[PDB]
Design a protein around this ligand. Structure first.
Ligand SMILES: *[C@@H]1O[C@H](CO[C@@H]2O[C@@H](C)[C@@H](O)[C@@H](O)[C@@H]2O)[C@@H](O[C@@H]2O[C@H](CO)[C@@H](O[C@@H]3O[C@H](CO[C@H]4O[C@H](CO)[C@@H](O)[C@H](O)[C@@H]4O[C@@H]4O[C@H](CO)[C@@H](O[C@@H]5O[C@H](CO)[C@H](O)[C@H](O)[C@H]5O)[C@H](O)[C@H]4NC(C)=O)[C@@H](O)[C@H](O[C@H]4O[C@H](CO)[C@@H](O)[C@H](O)[C@@H]4O[C@@H]4O[C@H](CO)[C@@H](O)[C@H](O)[C@H]4NC(C)=O)[C@@H]3O)[C@H](O)[C@H]2NC(C)=O)[C@H](O)[C@H]1NC(C)=O
Ligand SMILES: *[C@@H]1O[C@H](CO[C@@H]2O[C@@H](C)[C@@H](O)[C@@H](O)[C@@H]2O)[C@@H](O[C@@H]2O[C@H](CO)[C@@H](O[C@@H]3O[C@H](CO[C@H]4O[C@H](CO)[C@@H](O)[C@H](O)[C@@H]4O[C@@H]4O[C@H](CO)[C@@H](O[C@@H]5O[C@H](CO)[C@H](O)[C@H](O)[C@H]5O)[C@H](O)[C@H]4NC(C)=O)[C@@H](O)[C@H](O[C@H]4O[C@H](CO)[C@@H](O)[C@H](O)[C@@H]4O[C@@H]4O[C@H](CO)[C@@H](O)[C@H](O)[C@H]4NC(C)=O)[C@@H]3O)[C@H](O)[C@H]2NC(C)=O)[C@H](O)[C@H]1NC(C)=O
Ligand SMILES: *[C@@H]1O[C@H](CO)[C@@H](O[C@@H]2O[C@H](CO)[C@@H](O[C@@H]3O[C@H](CO)[C@@H](O)[C@H](O)[C@@H]3O)[C@H](O)[C@H]2NC(C)=O)[C@H](O)[C@H]1NC(C)=O
Ligand SMILES: *[C@@H]1O[C@H](CO[C@@H]2O[C@@H](C)[C@@H](O)[C@@H](O)[C@@H]2O)[C@@H](O)[C@H](O)[C@H]1NC(C)=O
Ligand SMILES: [Cl-]
Lengths: 149, 215, 213
């Protein structure tokens, strides 16, 4: 039950690849999985078998220009927080800002991942990203990140 | 060449002309304009909504090749005079293959208490009367919203040699404007009565007229 | 073509009033936004008609609420240079720009034309109201750069608004400025003046009075 890439939140037309140690929404599949170009229906619960029966692994396919991706949303103090501002069809994104609690925290001329190497309590809040695709101003939905000790 | 269009189409949604909403004889329209439509994905699907309820009476215009190698694609929706002035919201939903989702745009009349225009005609300055042409002035103030139409007449016939300033926000949050009608001095000296016609929602019958002549 | 991300540059002219009154200093302002923390160094080269000039006063970079830097350079300008139509060029260099960004501005071109200025009292119908409108009509001017003001007993009047320039059918501009005053002051016979500053007036200045008669 491994995701390649690790992003569990993806965007329509993203390639996902799933690995084993299938049941799509507790139901049989076409082969014994490569998603070539996602849609909203590719969302939901996923499990695998050939060995035992795996845990549940959730995949959210979203619709939008931008999607703020993280490996998870709950982090220990001093853990590294890796945020990716993912654009639809990997469309070139420029003048990119990652916001926290409605304030610009980090700015990039060209789309770049915003890596925080050592999480602190101060890193909790709602995050989103925005940027320019050509001359269109676009933003992602917000996500909540919480930090514990 | 052809431009890159990384963000796909953009939408601009425009209101009816003020006079069109105020005269029952005329046909007010909301116009949904889509630009940066590529040659490869040139189809645009329009859905229209009035206060969230879908309507089906829009006119679909033929697409227009622009000089930058894009299409301009337009849908026009005729509205009801009362709905616009009562503040219904007009929603244009634009679908196109180059986008991740539909673009939605909404427009309505500006909100806030309507205020009646006060209308004042002002003769030419004594110093202008040495010229061959003179300026007749119409001041329209104290009005809200800014949507207003202004015209001139003399003796039942339109006078068109005029220019009107845009609306200007005054210190009390109302608007004012000025309209300047330029006439031949002979016509003013003869005693012809000129009139400044103003149309606005807060006027009785949406119409008032003030006149101006020599004394 | 079009360019990708990087700093952006905006170049602003002097205030019209500052270019016409010799007691004032006109400035040309080059603003650079979206400067990253990673490459915050910004160099300004300033050219007048082609000739590099130094003497531009560069403010130090300022942290914006969105986590970018903004840097302003201000070139003081000679009144007559701006009026004679000289081009002012701002060149901005920075490591994140592949090529430096250049911006040029100057006074609008075309044959200057003298405003005529006419003051107009309130309509008789407005004399019913608590306040009244004194109107200043300014027409025949070119270019649109202008400043208009109201005065009484050598002090500026507070409560006035001026329309933007509107293009007349002959290619010149007009506007109206409305001064609102309490009716008492008008009927007591106080004198009000519309002042107009434009490059095509003698001494870049004229004024016209208005009072009850
Ligand atoms: C490729 O080319 C195309 C076309 O190019 C053009 O042709 C070539 C040859 C060039 O010369 C070029 O200059 C020409 O434009 C490009 O298309 C243009 O794209 C830009 C954006 O990039 C558009 O810019 C917007 O303009 C809006 C105003 O547009 C009107 O006015 C202009 C003139 O100023 C006209 O040219 C337009 O066509 C619009 O005119 C109106 O059209 C209506 C419909 O026809 C008319 O209403 C109807 O009229 C009929 C009768 O005719 C009936 O009466 C109906 O009842 C009635 O409905 C209307 O009368 C008419 N008005 C006229 C003629 O005056 C701007 O509003 C808009 O600005 C907003 O958004 C900007 C974001 O880009 C932002 O920066 C601004 O701040 C502003 O933001 C808004 O601000 C207001 C308050 O001020 C707020 O309320 C808003 O909330 C706020 N935000 C918003 C809305 O998000 C744009 O500047 C331009 O319109 C468009 N041109 C055309 C012709 O469509 C294209 O970009 C090029 N692409 C590339 C990649 O190069
Ligand atoms: C991160 O933040 C910064 C700044 O943050 C800001 O503060 C926070 C809290 C927020 O509130 C945020 O919104 C604030 O901006 C962001 O920086 C902004 O970046 C945008 C671009 O993304 C800039 O937008 C341009 O603005 C121009 C207008 O700017 C003036 O007016 C606005 C208000 O409307 C002010 O806020 C500005 O500061 C500017 O104000 C002027 O400043 C002058 C210099 O100081 C003053 O002149 C001087 O005055 C003194 C007296 O004090 C002396 O007298 C001097 O002599 C005199 O020089 C002047 O008085 C003052 N005017 C005022 C207050 O009115 C727009 O012109 C510009 O539009 C053009 O370009 C667009 C392309 O982006 C295009 O779409 C438009 O259609 C238009 O097109 C051009 O038109 C011109 C002219 O007609 C033509 O030359 C060209 O043909 C044409 N195309 C071009 C050039 O391509 C933009 O809208 C914005 O200015 C800037 N703000 C600041 C403060 O710097 C930043 O974007 C954020 N980054 C991210 C990633 O989020
Ligand atoms: C597997 O189960 C998941 C989880 O329920 C399914 O995801 C859901 O898919 C539907 C339609 O594909 C989504 O509905 C759509 O979105 C909005 C909801 O606001 C609705 O208004 C639209 O009309 C549209 O029907 C739904 O949101 C989505 N839910 C989540 C949480 O992702 C998935 O489709 C299932 N897959 C299969 C193959 O059965
Ligand atoms: C983008 O715009 C921000 C806020 O504007 C709002 O969002 C965009 C998508 C437009 O639809 C606009 O009409 C909305 O009101 C600005 O504060 C910000 O500076 C811009 N962001 C960047 C990264 O340039
Ligand atoms: Cl400015």
């Amino acid at each position: 039950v491994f995701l390649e890439p690790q992003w569990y939140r993806v965007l329509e037309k993203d390639s996902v690849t799933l690995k084993c140690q299938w049941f799509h929404n507790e139901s049989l599949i076409s082969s014994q999985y490569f998603i070539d170009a996602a849609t909203v229906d590719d969302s939901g619960e996923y499990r695998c078998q050939t060995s035992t029966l795996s845990d549940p692994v959730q995949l959210e396919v979203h619709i939008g220009w931008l999607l703020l991706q993280a490996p998870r949303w709950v982090f220990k103090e001093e853990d590294p927080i890796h945020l990716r501002c993912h654009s639809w069809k990997n469309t070139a994104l420029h003048k990119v800002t990652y916001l926290q609690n409605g304030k610009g925290r980090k700015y990039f001329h060209h789309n770049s991942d915003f890596y925080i190497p050592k999480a602190t309590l101060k890193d909790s809040g709602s995050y989103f990203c925005r940027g320019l695709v050509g001359s269109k101003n676009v933003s992602s939905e917000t996500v909540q990140i919480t930090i514990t000790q | 060449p052809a431009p890159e269009l990384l963000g796909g189409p953009s939408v601009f949604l425009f209101p009816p002309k003020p006079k069109d909403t105020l005269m029952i004889s005329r046909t007010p329209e909301v116009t949904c304009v889509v630009v940066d439509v590529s040659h490869e994905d040139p189809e645009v699907k329009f859905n229209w909504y009035v206060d969230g309820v879908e309507v089906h009476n829009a006119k679909t215009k033929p697409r227009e090749e622009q000089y930058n190698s894009t299409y301009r694609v337009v849908s026009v929706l005729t509205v009801l005079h009362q709905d616009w002035l009562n503040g219904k919201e007009y929603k244009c939903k634009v679908s196109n293959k180059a986008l991740p989702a539909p673009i939605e745009k909404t427009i309505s009349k500006a909100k806030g208490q309507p205020r009646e225009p006060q209308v004042y005609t002002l003769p030419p300055s004594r110093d202008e009367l040495t010229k061959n042409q003179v300026s007749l002035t119409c001041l329209v103030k104290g009005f809200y919203p800014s949507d207003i139409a202004v015209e001139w007449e003399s003796n039942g016939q339109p006078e068109n040699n005029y220019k009107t300033t845009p609306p200007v926000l005054d210190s009390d949050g109302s608007f004012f404007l000025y309209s300047k009608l330029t006439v031949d001095k002979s016509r003013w000296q003869q005693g012809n009565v000129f009139s400044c016609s103003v149309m606005h929602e807060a006027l009785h019958n949406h119409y008032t007229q003030k006149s101006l002549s020599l004394s």
